[PDB]
Design a protein around this ligand. Structure first.
Ligand SMILES: O=C(O)CCC(=O)C(=O)O
Ligand SMILES: [Mn+2]
Ligand SMILES: [Mn+2]
Ligand SMILES: [Mn+2]
Length: 190
């Protein structure tokens, strides 16, 4: 079980809209990614936090030039997550510290398209999707290293997403300890 719903209603409506594929990436693929990004990210300071920022305890980069092994993975993501849809010119790499987390938010409708897909690296975390009008409507998705999640349609427009902080990091009743986490985010264009 990598998904948990607030009821079978939200589960029915989002079965093809909020998708997780654990084991999308192989060990080699995970490491290929770690090797390439680590020195690029390590050149940056974890940013000053802002109460009014969705993301906390983070540093990031936008990557558009890839080695051939990495390019192969992006295409696999592209093939699995996007229809006949155009991708943004760059890919978002997010690096969260163990004490870092992401607050509830909908990814900007001006600059993001209908599909968001993301790979998680290094450490397990929990993405919770809560309905923007109804706090009672939610899903939790368990994101282990090497997993690809896809959020599209209703899961991308009508729900918020967030990556729970360590103290609040529960998949159901199970504790998911938070460590440092690298994520690689592909977004469709408007
Ligand atoms: O790491 C992730 O998958 C979350 C990325 C995200 O929500 C964002 O940067 O808007
Ligand atoms: Mn920045
Ligand atoms: Mn987001
Ligand atoms: Mn129980």
């Amino acid at each position: 079980m990598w998904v948990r719903g607030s009821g079978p209603s939200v589960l029915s409506r989002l079965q093809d809209a909020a998708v997780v594929r654990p084991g999308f990436l192989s060990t080699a693929e995970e490491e290929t990614l770690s090797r390439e990004l680590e020195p690029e990210l390590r050149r940056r300071r974890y940013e000053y936090d802002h109460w009014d920022a969705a993301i906390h305890g983070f540093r990031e980069t936008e990557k558009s030039r890839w080695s051939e092994a990495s390019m192969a993975i992006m295409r696999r993501v592209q093939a699995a997550a996007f229809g006949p849809q155009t991708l943004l010119s760059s890919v978002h790499v997010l690096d969260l510290e163990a004490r870092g987390y992401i607050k509830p938010h909908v990814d900007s409708i001006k600059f993001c398209g209908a599909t968001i897909a993301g790979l998680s690296l290094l450490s397990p975390s929990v993405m919770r999707l809560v309905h923007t009008q109804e706090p009672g409507e939610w899903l939790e998705l368990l994101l282990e290293p090497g997993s690809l999640y896809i959020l599209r349609g209703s899961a991308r427009y009508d729900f918020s997403h967030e990556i729970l902080r360590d103290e609040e990091s529960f998949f159901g009743e199970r504790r998911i300890p938070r460590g440092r986490r690298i994520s690689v985010i592909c977004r469709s264009l408007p």
